[PDB]
């Protein structure tokens, strides 16, 4: 039931496969890819080496056969990326979006909570 990742910028991660919809609302990987291109300059900037993984974990969350929820990022990784990259966005009059609000992810990977804590 898991589909291969078709987004070229989300390829050499820990995982190979996804299932839509993602944590942003897209039913189609192509819609996620288009929206993700917004961030490639921020990724090239290199405010956080975890940014690419964080974004991919949100736009194409991990899929496994044994689990039937998508697996996105833990809230600690989100915070670590936000704290480094938000100040760069604010220089250009941009803000960290609600769609990546770190409180909406699980604080840590628990028995309560399934999430990827990042590399
Ligand atoms: C982020 O989400 C939390 C939890 O839903 C919400 O309470 C909060 O309003 C959001 N953060 C901010 C700064 O509004
Ligand atoms: Cl904070």
UniProtKB/Swiss-Prot annotation:
Changing residue 62 to V: In EVR1; loss of function. Almost ubiquitous. Largely expressed in adult heart, skeletal muscle, ovary, and fetal kidney. Moderate amounts in adult liver, kidney, pancreas, spleen, and fetal lung, and small amounts in placenta, adult lung, prostate, testis, colon, fetal brain and liver. Disulfide bonds join 2-63, 10-56, 47-85, 74-115, 78-102. Ubiquitinated by ZNRF3, leading to its degradation by the proteasome. Residues 1-119 are extracellular. Residues 1-118 form the FZ domain. Changing residue 114 to V: In EVR1; loss of function. Glycans are attached at residues 16, 101. It is found in: Cell membrane. It comes from the Eukaryota. Lys-Thr-X-X-X-Trp motif interacts with the PDZ domain of Dvl (Disheveled) family members and is involved in the activation of the Wnt/beta-catenin signaling pathway. The FZ domain is involved in binding with Wnt ligands. Interacts with MAGI3 and NDP. Component of a complex, at least composed of TSPAN12, FZD4 and norrin (NDP). Interacts (via FZ domain) with TSKU; TSKU competes with WNT2B for binding to FZD4, inhibiting Wnt signaling and repressing peripheral eye development. Interacts with glypican GPC3. Receptor for Wnt proteins. Most frizzled receptors are coupled to the beta-catenin (CTNNB1) canonical signaling pathway, which leads to the activation of disheveled proteins, inhibition of GSK-3 kinase, nuclear accumulation of beta-catenin (CTNNB1) and activation of Wnt target genes. Plays a critical role in retinal vascularization by acting as a receptor for Wnt proteins and norrin (NDP). Belongs to the G-protein coupled receptor Fz/Smo family. It is linked to Vitreoretinopathy, exudative 1: A disorder of the retinal vasculature characterized by an abrupt cessation of growth of peripheral capillaries, leading to an avascular peripheral retina. This may lead to compensatory retinal neovascularization, which is thought to be induced by hypoxia from the initial avascular insult. New vessels are prone to leakage and rupture causing exudates and bleeding, followed by scarring, retinal detachment and blindness. Clinical features can be highly variable, even within the same family. This is Frizzled-4. It comes from Homo sapiens (Human). The chain holds residues 44 to 162 of 537 of the full protein.
